[PDB]
Amino acid sequence: HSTAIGRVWLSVIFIFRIMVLVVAAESVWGDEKSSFICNTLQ
Amino acid sequence: HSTAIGRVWLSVIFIFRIMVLVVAAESVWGDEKSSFICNTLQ
């Protein structure tokens, strides 16, 4: 019922985004706050 | 040989300055650098 080009390509890009987000959230952004340090005694 | 007013008053003020400097150096300025602290980790 839907268009040929739309569903397949949109689903593929959505799955790619999900995979990239999973990898980045699991690994890259885990210690964004714990390792965030400033040069001060305050 | 010198003037009446000069020697006595100058000597008294000089001795006063010496005593004040002795007290201040012994006590007030002893930890001017050791207790000098800045708010930084540098």
Interface of B with A (CB under 8 A): 39-42
* Contacts with B39 (C-beta within 8 Å, 6 or more apart), sequence order: A40, A41, A42
Structure tokens at B34: 């050791």
Q: How were these coordinates obtained?
A: cryo-EM
CA angle B33, B34, B36 (to 5 degrees): 60
Answer positive or negative: Cα dihedral of B33, B36, B41, B42.
Answer: negative
B contacts of A40 (beta carbons < 8 Å):
39-41
CA B23 to chain centre: 7
* Contacts with A41 (C-beta within 8 Å, 6 or more apart), sequence order: B39, B40, B41
Structure tokens at B10: 């100058």
- Give me the amino acid identity at B30: G
* Contacts with A29 (C-beta within 8 Å, 6 or more apart), sequence order: none
A contacts of B39 (beta carbons < 8 Å):
40-42
Q: Do A39 and B38 form a contact (C-beta atoms < 8 A)?
A: no
